[PDB]
Amino acid sequence: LFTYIIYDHLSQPELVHDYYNNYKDQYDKEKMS
Amino acid sequence: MAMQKLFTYIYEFIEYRKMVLLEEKVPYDKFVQMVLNTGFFRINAETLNHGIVSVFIFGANGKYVHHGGDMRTLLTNTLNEKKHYEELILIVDKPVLSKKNILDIIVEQRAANPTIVINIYPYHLFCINIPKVSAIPKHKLITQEEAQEFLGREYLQPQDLMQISASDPPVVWLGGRPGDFVQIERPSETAMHAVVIRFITKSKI
C-alpha cells in the first residue's frame, strides 16, 4: 500500500506497528542511554 | 564499479573515434579475469587511415602500475611488433597518474618513438560516454583549411586562440592532437548557443 506517511487509512499502519513495536521500543531504549 | 563502466564504455569510445574493432569482444567475467591475471587488458582497433590503435586497460592493483620496469618492458615489447600503431592509450587509476616513476618511463618511451603517440589516461575518462554528457558542449575537430581561412579572415594566429588541452575528455574522445583546432558549439544564455574555436595544445602528460 502507501503506509509510509499516510497513517489515516488505518489497519495497515496498525499491523506494522503492532508487529514491530518491541523492536522500536528496545532501539529507543538503547539510543537514549 | 569502475571496471564494469570501463568495459561497457571503452568500446563506444572506440566507435565514436570511428575505429573498426579487431579480434573479438569478451564477456565481463572473462574481462576481469584477464585484468586480474595478466594485470591488464589490451584492445586493438583500426582507424580509417589503416593505422592501428591499441588500448591498454591496466588494473588498479596490477604489477604493471607498481613497478616501472614492468611497464617499460611492456611498452618496449608492444612497440616492437609490426603494426602502424597510430596511438597507444593506457588507462590507469587516478593515483597512477601521480606516481612520477611510471610517468618517467612513459616520457622516455614517447621520446624513443616520436612518430608513435602514447597517452596515459585515468579511469574516469572512459567510465562514461563523454560526448553524451549534458554539461559537455559539442566539440568537433575542424580541418586545417577551415581553421586557416577563419584565422585569415580574423587576422589571427593559431597562438592567439583560446587553448584546450589534448587530454581534455571531449578532445580525447575526438582524437584531437596538439596543434589542431576544435570547434565548440556552446550553449549560451545571452545568444541561445554560440560557436568558439579553440587551439589544441600539449596534453597534460
Binding site: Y27 | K5, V133, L156, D168, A191
Partner: protein
C-alpha cells in the same frame, strides 16, 4: 633638435651591470661633502649634475629648472666590489653550478636540456654538486654555504676548510663563465653572472632623493673612502680584522639602501626606508602615485538633497564656482561671449581669475589687465564656473560604472550654502545618502575633457545599469508614496479628486511646459490619474503590471479597490491602478521609466522622473503624509491575538521539549539528536502567516503611514512591521539559534544550565513597540552587532575581491572584430557571445516556446494562401522553438535550479516596434493581397538572412561576402524573435512600405545596441560582479557556517575565484538524478538511494579499538572473557576457521550500538564490507544478539601477507587503512538529502510542461566519478558545485559553464547581466586550465606583463624575476601604460585620428 612625438610600446627589464652604470652616469661621486655653502658640492652626492631639487640652482646636465628636470644618475666607483642585493639568490644559484677554479659548469648541461629556460638554473642548483670533480681542471667543488648572520655573505666549505667568498673572489669566479654556459642554463646573454658583482654602483638621481635616504648614501661614500683603492683579494688571503669589518659594513649599507625592511622569498640569510620599500602596499609608490594620483582643480563637500534640481544637475556653491575655473581659449567666435567674464574679473560673478596671453606665452593676472579693453585671438581666459557647465560628480568608494557621472552645474548663489546639492533620485548612481556622505566634484577645464564629459560620461548614459541591464533611477521614498497617494482611486475623504486650481498647482515645479486647463471650470474635479496622464502623454508608453500595493498576503484583510490593483497605461494615459515601486520605483525593471528610456532615450526618462517626482511631491504638499506612534500600536484585542499566536508557537516548542524529555525524538539518518532538535525548534518558532491578521485589524491601511510606506515599497518590509508591532521572534545567527557560550550549557547568566525554553536560546516574544527585556535586548544586541560586523568587513572583503578581479580582467578589451582579447590573445570570440552592450537590452517573451504542436499551428501557421512558402515559414518557426527548447533544457540539466524561461534579453523589442507602427498607421485591416503578403514574407526572410551583417558593415552586406559561423550564431536569438513577431499571421495589416520601415528600425536598434570598439569590458564585468559581493556579505549572518556547508562571508566566492582545489572547498554540493524517469516520483525510493549513497566508514561505528600482539588457532587480560563469543563464532562459522598464516598482530574494536541503530548499520554489512574488501585479514564478531549492556566486539586478526620499516608501525598503518574503509556509501559524501526538483519536459503533444514532482539527491560533498559509478543515478546529469571536479572529469568548457553557474548562484537574484559572468568564466578558462583571479592566475595568463603583475602585488619579486629573465613587457591594457606615465589605448583613444589631407586641401 625637435624631439619628435613618441609613445612607449614595450619595456625591457635587465640586470644593470657596472658597465651600464658607467655608460649612464653623468658624474662620478668622489667626496663626502654635501653642500658648498648655498650650492651643492661638486663631486658629492648632492652634485647638481645629478639633477636639481631646489629652486636655488639649475641642473647643469640638462640646464632645466626643478620642475623640468627628471634627474640623472651618477657613479660611485667602489674600491671593493659589492654583490647586487636584489640578486643574491641568483649569485647563490650560479655559485653552486659552475667550477670556482676555471668557471666551467660542474653540472651536466645535457641533463637539463629538456626543461624550460626559466627552470634550468634552478634545477641545476637544486642538485648537491658538493664534492663533484671538475672535468677540466680536476678541482673539487666546495659546499656553498650562505651565512646566517646576514643576507649577502657566502662561505666556501671544502671538507671543513672554511674561507669567505668575497665579492672580488665571486667576480673572479663569475668572470670565467662562458656565454655558452649561460645560454645552456636557460639564462639570457644579458643575464651573465658577471653583472651580479658591482665595482661601480649607481647613486640615484636627486629627483628620487629630495632634501632620509641620503644619510645611507653619505655613509656608504664615507665608508668607501676608507677601503684602499688597490685592495686585491684572492681566494684564501686572510684579510686581518678591519678591512673585513669595513667590507661587511659597506655591503650591509648597500643592502639596506636597496632592500631594507623588505624580505621577499628569494632572500637567503638571516638577522631610512629603502628604494624597494617605497614600492609595495597601498601607501607605496605604485598604488599611491601611479595607479592613483592627487590632482588639482577639484572640490569636496557634504551632499544634501534638493528636489528642485534635475537628475542630471548638481547644486554648486558659488564660493566653489569662483575657485574652480574653466579654460576658454579666446577666438573670433567666442570673444563677444567671453568679454563679460573678462570685464567682471575677480570683483563680480561670473568673472575670471587668470588670462594666458599668447603673445607673451604666459599667464596674466586679471587685476593687471585693466588696460587691455578687450581680449586677443588665441588668448586663454580662466573664467568662473557658471550654471550649465558640466562637472564630474564622484562618491567614494567608486565601485560602479556610474560612481563617476557628469552633471550640469547649477550655481547656488546663496553664500551660506556649502554643500553639493543633488536630486534624491540621482543618489542611486552613487549609492549615496544624505547622512554625512561627501562627494568629489571637479569641473573639466580643457576642451577635450569638456567634450567627453558632455558626450560620454553624462549620467543619462548611466540611467540603465551596466550590471543588471535595467534602470537605475526612479521614484524614491516620498516620491513613491506620493505617486501612490496621487494615483489612488479613493482617499479617506472620498474620491481622490482636486479642483482646477490644485490640478494646476501640481505642475508648478515640473519645469516642463504646463498642460492646458482652459477646458476645465474652476469647480471641475480632476482625479490624480488625469494629471498623471497629462504628464505622461508627452512620452506615450504601454504599461500593464500589478502594483506593489496589491499583495496577496494583505488580501484576506483590508478591502482592495479593484481600480487600484491593476495598473494600466495605454499610450501615456493612466487608466487604472496606482503608481508605486513596481511602476515608478528606482531599479524597477519593466517600469514606466525603463519603457520611456527604451522608446525615447534616457534623457527623456530622467526628465520624466523629475516631472513625476514634482507631481507626487506637490500632491503630498496638500494631502500630507506622516507616521505616528499610534501607527505602530496594536489594539488590545489584536495584542491578545498576537499573544495567543506566540503562545501557540511556544506550546509547539514545549511539545518538542516534552518529546525530548521522554526520549521520543528520533533523528533521521544523517543528523544527530541535537541537530534534529535544533531544526525542529527552528521550524516550530517561525511566525505563521496569520500574524498579519492582528496587525491589519489594528491598522487603517488607507490612513496608516507606516503601512503605506511598507506596502507601496517606499521603505520597509513586512518583517519590519511584524517586529515593530507583533514580535521579533527567534533570533537566528548563521541559520542556528543562540549558542550556549556563557558556560557549559548556558546561553546567559539569566537562564539556567540546559534550559529547554525557547526564550533562553534567542526567541524574542516581545515587539519593539512593547519593549524588550534585558535578555531579549542582549540577544537583539548580538544580532545587531553581527549586522554591524558584517557591514564593516563587507567593505574590506569587497575591496580585496574587487581589486583582484579588476587586475585579472582589466586587460580584456573589445577589439574591432568585437572580440575580447588580452593584447592579441583571444578571450571571447564575441563579447557576451552576442556583441551587445549591457545598457541596450530589453527582456522580451518568446511566444512560441511553451506552445504545443497544435497551438503553434493554430497561432502561427498562416492559411490564407496555398503556397509552400508559408509551410516553410512555419517549419522554420517550429525548428526555432525546438532548438530553443533543446538548448535551454540542456542548460537545465547541468544546473541546480536554473529553470527554462520564456523571456530573453534582446537588443530589439520587435513587437513594440510593430505596435508603434500600427498605432501610427493611417489605415487598418488592409484588404487581402497575395502579392503584398508574399513580398513581406520575402523581405522578412532576406532580412533574417542578412541580419549577421550588422556585426560587420553595409559594405560586406552589399558584397554578400561569407559570414563567419560565430556571427551567424550571434544573430540566432534576434532571428528567432523577428520570425516570431514578424510572422505572416501577425503582419496582415502591415503594408510593404511599413514592413520596410519596421525592418529599418530593427536594423537601427540592433546597430545601436552593439558594444563599442575599445570598451574595457573586463573592468565592467569586474565592477558588475564585485558590486553584489558586498550585499552577499550583508547576508553573511543568514548563511550557514557549520562544516561541510560553510557559506558565510566570502568563502564560496574566494573558492570560485581562487580556483581552489576540491579538498579546499567548504560548501561542496552535488545533485544526482535517478537513472529511471518513471520512478523519480517516488519520494521513498529517493530517500532510500540518498541514505544508501551516504558515506559510512568503519571509524564512524567504532567506540574504541585495541591492537594486540596475540595470534589465534595469547590474550590481553582485560578481554579474557572474549573467548566465549570467540568460540561461539568458531562454532557458528564452520567455513571461517582461522587460516594457517595467522600472525601476532590483531585489532579488537568495540562497535558503537547507538550509531549502528541510528545509521541502520547491521553487523553483517560490516562483516561483508570488510571480508570481501580485505585480502590479508581474518575477522571475527560477537553474537549480534547483544542488548544494552553487552557490546558487539570485532576482532580483526592480521596475516603476515600484510607484513610481507618497523613491524609495529606498519601494523598501525594497516589499522588506519582498515578503519578508513568504506562500509557504506560513496567517498566524499558526508550527507545526502532528498530535494524536490522543478524541471521541464516536452510531452507527446509538443508542449513544455513544468514538473514539480521530481525527486533528486542533493549530497554534501562532491564525487563525480563515484556518483557516476553507481547505477541508481543518471550519469549524464550529475551537477556538482565543485569547479575543479567538473574540470577534471568533464573538461574546460564544462568548467567554464560551472564557473558561470557558481558565480550566478553567489550573486543571487539581484545578480549582474550574464555577459559579465561570461567575461569572468572566459578569462579564467582561456588557457585550457581553470586559472584563478589571484597572482598565480595573472602569472599564468599574462607572464610578460611585468608592470601589471607589479601593480597587483609583490612588486619586488616580479621586478627581480623580470630583471633576471630579461623580460620584455609590451605596453597594453591599463596597468602597464599607467605605470609608464602614459594613457591606456582604449575608449576614446582606442582608435586614432588622422587629418583628411585631401578634404582639407580641397575645402581649406
Amino acid at each position: 633638435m625637435e624631439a619628435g612625438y613618441a609613445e612607449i610600446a614595450a619595456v625591457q627589464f635587465n640586470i644593470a651591470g657596472d658597465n651600464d652604470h658607467k655608460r649612464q652616469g653623468v658624474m662620478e661621486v668622489t667626496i663626502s661633502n654635501l653642500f658648498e655653502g648655498t650650492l651643492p658640492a661638486e663631486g658629492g652626492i648632492y652634485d647638481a649634475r645629478m639633477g636639481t631639487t631646489d629652486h636655488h640652482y639649475k641642473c647643469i646636465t640638462c640646464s632645466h629648472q626643478r620642475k623640468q628636470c627628471m634627474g640623472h644618475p651618477g657613479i660611485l666607483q667602489m674600491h671593493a666590489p659589492v654583490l647586487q642585493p636584489l640578486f643574491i639568490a641568483e649569485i647563490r644559484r650560479w655559485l653552486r653550478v659552475i667550477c670556482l677554479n676555471c668557471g666551467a659548469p660542474i653540472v651536466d648541461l645535457k641533463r637539463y636540456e629538456h626543461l624550460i629556460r626559466p627552470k634550468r638554473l634552478i634545477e641545476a642548483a637544486s642538485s648537491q654538486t658538493e664534492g663533484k670533480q671538475c672535468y677540466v681542471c680536476k678541482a673539487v667543488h666546495p659546499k656553498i654555504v650562505k651565512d646566517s648572520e646576514d643576507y649577502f655573505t657566502f662561505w666556501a666549505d671544502q671538507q671543513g676548510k672554511i674561507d669567505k667568498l668575497y665579492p672580488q673572489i665571486i667576480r673572479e669566479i663569475f668572470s670565467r663563465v662562458t656565454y655558452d654556459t649561460v645560454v645552456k642554463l636557460g639564462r639570457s646573454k644579458n643575464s651573465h653572472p658577471e653583472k651580479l658583482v658591482l665595482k661601480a654602483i649607481q647613486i640615484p638621481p636627486i629627483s628620487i632623493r629630495p632634501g632620509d635616504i641620503n644619510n645611507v648614501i653619505q655613509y656608504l661614500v664615507r665608508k668607501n673612502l676608507l677601503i684602499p683603492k688597490d685592495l686585491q683579494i684572492v681566494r684564501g688571503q686572510k684579510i686581518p680584522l678591519n678591512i673585513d669589518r669595513n667590507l661587511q659594513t659597506i655591503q650591509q649599507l648597500y643592502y639596506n639602501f636597496l632592500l631594507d625592511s623588505v624580505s621577499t622569498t628569494a632572500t637567503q640569510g638571516g638577522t631610512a626606508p629603502s628604494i624597494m620599500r617605497r614600492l609595495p602596499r597601498k601607501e607605496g609608490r605604485i598604488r599611491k602615485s601611479l595607479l592613483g594620483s592627487q590632482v588639482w582643480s577639484i572640490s569636496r563637500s557634504t551632499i544634501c538633497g534638493n528636489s528642485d534640481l534635475h537628475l542630471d544637475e548638481v547644486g554648486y556653491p558659488i564660493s566653489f564656482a569662483r575657485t574652480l575655473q574653466v579654460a576658454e581659449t579666446v577666438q573670433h567666435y567666442n570673444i563677444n561671449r567671453l568679454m563679460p567674464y573678462f570685464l567682471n574679473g575677480k570683483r563680480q560673478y561670473p568673472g575670471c581669475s587668470r588670462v594666458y596671453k599668447q603673445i607673451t606665452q604666459s599667464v596674466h593676472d586679471i587685476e593687471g589687465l585693466k588696460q587691455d579693453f578687450r581680449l586677443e585671438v588665441g588668448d586663454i581666459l580662466y573664467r568662473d564656473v557658471v550654471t550649465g557647465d558640466v562637472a564630474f560628480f564622484n562618491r567614494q568608494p567608486s565601485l560602479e560604472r556610474s560612481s563617476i557621472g557628469v552633471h550640469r552645474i547649477v550655481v547656488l548663489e546663496n553664500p551660506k550654502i556649502s554643500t553639493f546639492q543633488m536630486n534624491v533620485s540621482a543618489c542611486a548612481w552613487y549609492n549615496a545618502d544624505f547622512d554625512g556622505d561627501q562627494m568629489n566634484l571637479w569641473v573639466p577645464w580643457s576642451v577635450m575633457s569638456r567634450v567627453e564629459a558632455e558626450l560620454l560620461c553624462s549620467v543619462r548614459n548611466w540611467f540603465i545599469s551596466t550590471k543588471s541591464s535595467g534602470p537605475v533611477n526612479g521614484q524614491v521614498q516620498d516620491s513613491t508614496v506620493g505617486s501612490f497617494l496621487l494615483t489612488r482611486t479613493n482617499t479617506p475623504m472620498g474620491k481622490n479628486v482636486m479642483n482646477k486650481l490644485h490640478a494646476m498647482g501640481l505642475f508648478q515645479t515640473t519645469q516642463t511646459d504646463p498642460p492646458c486647463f482652459a477646458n476645465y471650470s474652476p469647480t471641475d474635479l480632476l482625479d490624480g490619474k488625469s494629471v498623471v496622464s497629462m504628464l505622461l502623454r508627452q512620452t506615450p508608453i504601454n504599461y500593464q503590471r500589478a502594483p506593489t500595493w496589491y499583495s496577496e498576503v494583505y488580501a484576506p484583510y483590508m478591502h482592495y479597490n479593484k481600480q487600484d490593483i491593476s495598473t494600466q497605461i495605454r499610450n501615456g494615459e493612466l487608466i487604472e491602478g496606482v503608481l508605486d515601486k513596481k511602476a515608478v520605483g528606482a531599479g524597477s525593471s519593466g517600469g514606466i521609466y525603463h519603457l520611456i528610456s527604451r522608446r525615447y532615450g534616457p534623457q527623456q526618462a530622467l526628465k520624466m522622473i523629475f516631472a513625476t517626482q514634482q507631481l507626487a511631491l506637490n500632491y503630498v504638499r496638500n494631502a500630507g503624509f506622516t507616521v505616528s506612534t499610534a501607527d505602530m500600536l496594536l489594539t488590545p484585542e489584536a495584542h491578545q491575538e498576537v499573544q495567543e499566536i506566540i503562545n501557540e508557537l511556544l506550546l509547539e516548542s514545549e511539545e518538542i521539549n516534552n518529546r525530548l524529555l521522554h526520549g521520543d525524538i528520533m533523528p533521521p539518518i544523517g543528523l544527530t539528536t541535537h541537530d534534529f532538535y535544533e531544526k525542529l525548534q527552528l521550524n516550530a518558532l517561525k511566525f505563521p502567516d496569520r500574524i498579519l491578521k492582528p496587525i491589519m485589524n489594528s491598522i487603517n491601511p488607507e490612513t496608516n503611514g507606516l503601512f503605506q510606506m511598507v506596502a507601496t515599497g517606499a521603505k520597509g518590509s513586512n518583517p519590519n512591521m511584524i517586529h515593530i508591532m507583533a514580535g521579533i521572534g527567534q533570533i537566528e545567527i548563521n541559520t542556528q539559534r543562540i549558542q550556549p557560550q556563557f558556560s557549559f550549557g548556558r546561553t546567559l547568566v539569566y537562564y539556567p544550565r540546559f534550559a529547554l525554553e525557547a526564550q533562553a536560546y534567542g526567541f524574542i516574544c516581545n515587539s519593539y513597540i512593547a519593549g524588550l527585556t534585558s535578555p531579549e535586548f542582549i540577544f537583539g544586541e548580538m544580532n545587531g552587532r553581527f549586522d554591524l560586523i558584517n557591514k564593516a568587513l563587507s567593505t574590506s572583503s569587497t575591496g580585496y575581491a574587487n581589486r583582484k578581479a579588476i587586475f585579472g580582467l582589466q586587460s580584456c578589451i573589445v577589439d574591432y572584430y568585437r572580440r575580447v582579447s588580452i593584447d592579441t590573445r583571444l578571450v571571447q570570440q564575441l563579447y557576451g557571445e552576442d556583441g551587445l552592450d549591457a545598457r541596450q537590452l530589453e527582456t522580451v517573451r518568446f511566444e512560441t516556446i511553451m506552445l504545443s504542436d497544435q497551438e503553434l499551428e493554430d497561432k502561427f501557421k498562416y492559411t490564407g494562401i496555398q503556397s509552400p512558402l508559408f509551410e516553410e515559414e512555419f517549419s522554420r518557426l517550429k525548428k526555432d522553438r525546438d532548438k530553443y527548447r533543446q538548448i535551454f533544457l540542456n542548460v537545465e540539466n547541468f544546473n541546480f535550479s536554473q529553470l527554462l524561461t520564456d523571456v530573453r534579453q534582446v537588443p530589439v523589442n520587435v513587437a513594440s516596434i510593430v505596435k508603434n507602427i500600427l498605432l501610427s498607421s493611417t489605415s487598418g485591416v488592409l484588404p487581402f493581397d497575395e502579392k503584398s503578403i508574399l513580398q513581406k514574407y520575402a523581405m522578412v526572410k532576406t532580412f533574417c538572412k542578412n541580419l549577421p551583417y550588422v556585426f560587420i558593415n553595409n559594405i560586406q552586406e552589399r558584397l554578400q561576402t561569407p559570414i563567419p559561423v560565430y556571427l551567424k550564431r550571434a544573430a540566432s536569438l534576434m532571428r528567432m524573435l523577428i520570425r516570431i513577431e514578424l510572422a505572416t499571421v501577425k503582419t496582415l495589416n502591415i503594408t510593404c512600405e511599413q514592413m520596410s520601415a519596421i525592418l529599418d528600425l530593427i536594423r537601427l536598434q540592433y546597430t545601436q545596441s552593439l558594444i563599442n570598439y575599445g570598451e574595457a569590458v573586463g573592468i565592467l564585468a569586474a565592477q558588475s560582479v564585485s558590486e553584489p559581493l558586498t550585499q552577499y556579505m550583508l547576508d553573511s549572518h543568514h548563511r550557514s557556517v557549520a562544516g561541510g556547508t560553510n557559506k558565510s562571508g566570502i568563502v564560496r566566492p574566494q573558492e570560485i575565484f581562487s580556483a581552489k582545489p576540491v579538498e579546499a572547498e567548504q560548501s561542496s554540493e552535488m545533485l544526482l538524478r535517478l537513472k529511471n524517469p518513471e520512478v523519480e516520483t517516488n519520494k521513498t525510493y529517493a530517500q532510500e538511494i540518498a541514505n544508501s549513497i551516504e558515506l559510512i566508514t568503519f571509524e564512524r561505528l567504532i567506540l574504541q579499538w585495541h591492537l594486540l600482539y596475540e595470534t589465534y588457532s595469547v590474550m590481553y587480560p582485560d578481554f579474557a572473557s572474549d573467548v566465549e563469543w570467540m568460540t561461539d563464532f568458531l562454532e557458528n562459522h564452520p567455513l571461517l576457521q582461522p587460516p594457517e598464516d595467522i600472525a601476532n598482530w590483531c585489532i579488537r574494536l568495540e562497535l558503537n550500538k547507538t550509531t549502528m541503530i541510528l545509521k541502520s548499520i547491521s553487523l553483517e554489512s560490516i562483516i561483508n564490507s570488510l571480508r570481501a574488501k580485505h585480502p590479508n585479514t581474518y575477522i571475527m564478531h560477537s553474537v549480534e544478539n547483544t542488548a544494552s549492556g553487552i557490546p558487539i566486539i570485532i576482532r580483526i586478526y592480521l596475516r603476515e601477507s600484510a607484513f610481507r620499516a618497523t613491524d609495529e608501525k606498519i601494523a598501525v598503518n594497516v589499522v588506519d587503512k582498515l578503519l578508513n574503509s568504506t562500509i557504506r556509501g560513496i567517498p566524499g559524501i558526508k550527507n545526502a538529502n532528498v530535494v524536490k526538483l522543478m524541471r521541464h519536459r516536452v510531452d507527446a503533444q509538443g508542449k513544455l510542461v513544468r514538473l514539480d514532482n521530481i525527486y533528486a539527491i542533493k549530497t554534501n560533498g562532491t564525487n563525480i566519478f563515484g556518483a557516476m559509478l553507481d547505477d541508481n543515478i543518471d550519469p549524464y546529469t550529475i551537477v556538482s558545485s565543485s569547479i575543479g571536479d567538473t574540470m577534471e572529469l568533464y573538461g574546460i568548457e564544462a568548467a567554464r559553464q560551472k564557473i558561470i553557474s557558481e558565480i550566478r548562484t553567489v550573486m543571487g537574484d539581484k545578480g549582474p547581466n550574464h555577459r559579465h559572468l561570461l567575461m569572468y568564466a572566459d578569462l579564467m578558462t582561456r588557457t585550457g586550465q581553470v586559472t584563478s583571479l589571484e597572482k598565480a592566475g595573472l602569472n599564468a595568463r599574462e607572464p610578460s606583463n611585468v608592470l601589471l603583475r607589479m601593480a597587483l602585488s609583490s612588486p619586488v619579486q616580479v621586478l627581480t624575476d623580470a630583471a633576471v629573465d630579461s623580460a620584455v613587457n609590451p605596453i597594453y591594457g591599463i596597468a602597464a601604460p599607467t605605470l609608464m606615465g602614459s594613457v591606456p589605448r582604449i575608449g576614446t583613444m582606442y582608435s586614432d585620428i588622422i587629418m583628411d589631407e585631401k578634404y582639407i586641401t580641397e575645402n581649406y
